[PDB]
Amino acid sequence: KHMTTSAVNIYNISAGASVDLAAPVTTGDIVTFFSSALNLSAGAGSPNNTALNLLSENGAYLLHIAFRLQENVIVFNSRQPNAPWLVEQRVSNVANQFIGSGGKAMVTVFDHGDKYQVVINEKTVIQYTKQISGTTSSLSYNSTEGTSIFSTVVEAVTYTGLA
């Protein structure tokens, strides 16, 4: 065959849950996490640190995106299976990254081979140089066993077979 066939896959990921991808994400592909909520409140009941993750088949964290309200930073990192975290990249001021977001948000990751480009709504927040390479085979959503900055269910959409 000569024509290009791409694919859309849709996943509902609860806080504290993971999904295995039916179509892996590789160079040229995209994943967007859609949240139907955004909670940036301080004080009692304030959200715990909340992460969205792209994992390889052996459980490496290819990209970990940790939104830390109290510390007021977004941390980007990677981690081999059963190993220490690698070198963090940080973006300061969580709320500033969600200006004009309203009551929902999206976090998009482009796999560009050597880098992951992360875009919050329309704003590129990092061109992250990869610390671990390879295909993404699962996604996960960690709210430190408690209150999340996002909706209880986040919808992940993958666009694959692009290249």
Ligand X SMILES: CC(=O)N[C@@H]1[C@@H](O)[C@H](O[C@@H]2O[C@H](CO)[C@H](O)[C@H](O[C@H]3O[C@H](CO)[C@H](O)[C@H](O)[C@H]3NC(C)=O)[C@H]2O[C@@H]2O[C@@H](C)[C@@H](O)[C@@H](O)[C@@H]2O)[C@@H](CO)O[C@H]1O
- Residues in contact with a second copy by CB under 8 A are 3-10, 28, 30, 32, 106, 108, 110, 112-115, 117, 119, 121-122, 124, 127, 157, 159, 162
Q: Cβ 32 to a second copy, closest distance in Å?
A: 8
108 binds, among a second copy, ligand X, none (CB under 5 to 8 A by kind): a second copy
Q: How far is the CB of 93 from a second copy (least distance, A)?
A: 20
CA–CA separation, 32 and 52 (whole Å): 11
Q: Is 51 exposed, middle or buried (0-12, 13-18, 19+ CB in 10 A)?
A: buried
Query: What token pair was written down for 135?
Result: 């295909």
Rounded least distance, CB 81 to ligand X, Å: 12
CB of 141 to ligand X, least distance (A): 9
Query: Out of a second copy, ligand X, none, which partner does residue 39 contact, by CB within 5 to 8 A per kind?
Result: none
Dihedral sign for Cα 163, 18, 49, 135, please: negative
Q: Which two tokens stand for residue 58?
A: 């052996």
CB-wise, 57 or 88, nearer to ligand X? Answer: 88
Could you tell which of a second copy, ligand X, none binds residue 24, using a CB distance below 5 to 8 A set by kind?
none
- Contacted entry of a second copy, ligand X, none for residue 88, CB cut-off 5 to 8 Å set by kind: ligand X
Query: Which residues are near ligand X by CB under 6 A?
Result: 49-51, 64, 66, 75, 77, 85, 88, 142, 144
What are the b/e assignments for 56-94, b being 16+ CB within 10 Å? beeebbbbbbbbbbeeebbbbbbbeeeeeeeeebebeeb
Token digits of residue 144: 């430190």
Helix (H, G, I), strand (E, B) or coil at 37: coil
